[PDB]
Design a protein around this ligand. Structure first.
Ligand SMILES: COc1ccc(C(=O)O)cc1NC(C)=O
Ligand SMILES: COc1ccc(C(=O)O)cc1NC(C)=O
Lengths: 413, 412
């Protein structure tokens, strides 16, 4: 069948700013920080002792305590966001459509907490103390697996793992499944909970994390002169993607249309982008061509914008290269300024922020942008939300391995 | 409407060999790759054997320094990928590098590296975690390192669908090409889950054969004495290529990838429905995708893991999809010889399905001494069977009820 149009009919989230989308979005537009000293473990030996935790999450709003005890937090978070998105869509799963509804919920590293805890059991006690649920409760594809089991989804069932690009790729490839007729509805996005010893210690050993322990809410400062690495955050984003005529037929509320998806590889370096952002540029131009757009139609870019020295300026270079003089008319912000870096879920929550930027015609701020670095001379929406016309919003993710993804969303009549 | 996709190169590490021809020579000889695990102390574990990759030399592929940055599963995935590209004869240029991508996945990923780094963390604190822990353990680093090494700028991703990973990776890469998003993709999977956590975790679930006294007899798909799967290591990669692109450069074509199916069971986390309803839907989706009648299938490479419920559910599914024809096709499980490579099982079994087409021979199901009740199909017991094969199907099923089927055809 011919390439079908794809719209967003349902969204769900857990973030450091809230336990759902409206709470998170209120935080985003008020310039609130989700970052705080981490409370759930003793980090005295760590060079980074803060991050974006999901605060007051109650898994018993979604699942029995008995089922939840078997699941890594990243699965709990992905199911919470997925259940919220499906309820938000209004979609009724039936025998007539269950084969046409799939799931692609990814993660950058999955059940690292559970693996850490089972490793402790293995090393201190022995293999007879490993949980029987260790494998199905830890491996990445089990957000998609448990969601299909709980809702009866018999469509394509899979998981992407493209590091910090996961959520963006998960949504774009799910959109491709619908576009090509493999599904009519997909639940897509990502979830992450890497806030354990191995996560904080592992990113710390790479010197990838901000060490601004004295001022955690000021640590995430994309494009600021004094940025010193990303802020590790937890949570999940899920969207219901639906073929347009399917959405119209059932009277679905449509938030936006997903018109463009771009992928590329930097083919440069395992953990750094090229300074010129050539890979980001190729990815954005792929996405824009896919969407059949004039680059001047882009009003808002939700940047990857992780608050790394090399990453932030490569993304400015890429936006300058793709958009030329128009780079000075669009608004570009990093919501990671507020949320920190949700890794495999970053692209999922940022896709939702991009859709809400279209719904509410507002560019979220880049908070903490006190001293824009050399060359950082675009409208980066410093400090405060900017009400403006937004017809087309782009969301960028880049990942270790030089894997790049871009989603293009537009207002739907 | 869509472009045709062919296989122009293959690469493999398995418990039967360090490349495709050595592995395939074992497959057709009925050789087992299973033995007691040597690389760790398994005294406290209920399973002490599995399929190790024997004699792998990463320095054929990477510098020692680069290899020290990567988990074994990434090393294995890169080995198979570099073999597959070399086997294809593909030349990457400035003219085509944005049209060549990679989808290499893993089921469990960097469990060995996570174990080693956790040992350091618990014994000495976080100052002893490797700087390369994150980039050297994450599942997308096969695709990432491969794209950096060869200058591939096309679609760069990784799938992770547990034991379905290799099958899904290959199919979704085939879709990328079919629909014009790439002209060449390197696809498949890798796995090295023989650490404490892999044998311990699958063992805690009572998923593994505990036949420690006879490791080469443990993997016995459809046999009445089967008692769970055998955990194996390795990798498979295929070069998938748009047909016009392959012809233009005079590529050697092994087979055409004509059909890909996916389905969810939506049933249970670790058990299929008894009637294999999800496997049936998946195989039908694959045959509808290919425009084939079930009667055109000659060979099925089963998922066939040697579990009680899983092996029977796959027989039920084949009987439902193929009706009378179920008794005319040949179906075997190469896991009888290789064990279960988890995320790489679908990748190596795709390659074995492609070679069944090249060589007109159904690989055996070894150890099938006493077929269980209802296991009355042609399961190619004990010995390789020369036979006509125009169409071969390869099934994978995974935790979460995630299913994949690939359909390959002789290319004329
Ligand atoms: C390819 O490079 C990267 C990809 C992703 C991230 C991230 O934190 O999301 C960071 C990097 N690297 C730098 C130095 O920013
Ligand atoms: C949906 O259930 C499964 C999926 C995959 C496997 C496997 O070993 O690859 C095993 C099972 N389950 C049983 C008991 O065979």
């Amino acid at each position: 069948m011919s390439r079908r149009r794809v719209v967003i009919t349902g969204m769900g989230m857990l973030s450091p700013l809230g336990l759902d989308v409206p709470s998170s979005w209120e935080g985003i537009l008020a310039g609130r920080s989700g970052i705080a000293p981490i409370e759930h473990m003793d980090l005295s030996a760590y060079s980074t002792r803060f991050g974006g935790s999901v605060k007051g999450f109650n898994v018993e709003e979604y699942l029995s305590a008995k089922e939840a005890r078997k699941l890594d937090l990243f699965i709990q978070y992905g199911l919470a966001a997925s259940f919220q998105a499906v309820r938000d869509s209004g979609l009724e799963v039936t025998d007539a459509n269950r084969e046409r509804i799939g799931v692609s919920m990814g993660s950058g590293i999955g059940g690292l907490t559970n693996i850490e805890n089972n490793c402790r059991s293995l090393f201190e006690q022995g293999p007879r103390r490993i949980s029987p649920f260790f494998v199905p409760g830890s491996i990445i594809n089990m957000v998609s697996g448990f969601l299909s089991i709980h809702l009866g989804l018999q469509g394509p069932n899979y998981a992407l793992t493209t590091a910090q690009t996961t959520g963006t790729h998960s949504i774009g490839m799910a959109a491709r499944n619908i576009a090509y007729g493999e599904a009519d509805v997909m639940v897509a996005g990502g979830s992450e909970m890497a806030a354990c010893g191995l996560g904080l210690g592992g990113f710390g050993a790479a010197r990838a994390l901000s060490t601004r322990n004295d001022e955690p809410t000021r640590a995430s400062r994309p494009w600021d002169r004094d940025r010193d690495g990303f802020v590790l955050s937890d949570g999940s984003g899920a969207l219901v993607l639906e073929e347009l005529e399917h959405a119209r037929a059932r009277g679905a509320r449509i938030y936006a249309e997903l018109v463009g998806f771009g992928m590329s590889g930097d083919a440069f370096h395992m953990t750094a982008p090229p300074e010129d952002g050539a890979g980001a540029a190729r990815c954005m131009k792929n996405a824009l061509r896919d969407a059949g757009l004039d680059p001047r139609q882009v009003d808002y870019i939700n940047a990857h914008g992780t608050s790394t020295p090399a990453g932030d300026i490569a993304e400015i270079a890429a936006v300058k290269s793709v958009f030329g003089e128009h780079a000075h008319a669009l608004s570009m912000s990093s919501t990671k300024s507020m949320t920190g870096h949700l890794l495999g879920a970053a692209g999922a929550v940022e896709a939702i922020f991009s859709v809400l930027a279209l719904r509410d015609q507002v560019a979220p701020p880049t908070i903490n942008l006190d001293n824009p670095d050399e060359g950082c001379d675009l409208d980066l929406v410093a400090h405060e939300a900017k009400p403006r016309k937004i017809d087309v919003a782009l969301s960028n993710s880049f990942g270790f391995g030089g894997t790049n993804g871009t989603l293009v969303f537009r207002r739907f009549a």
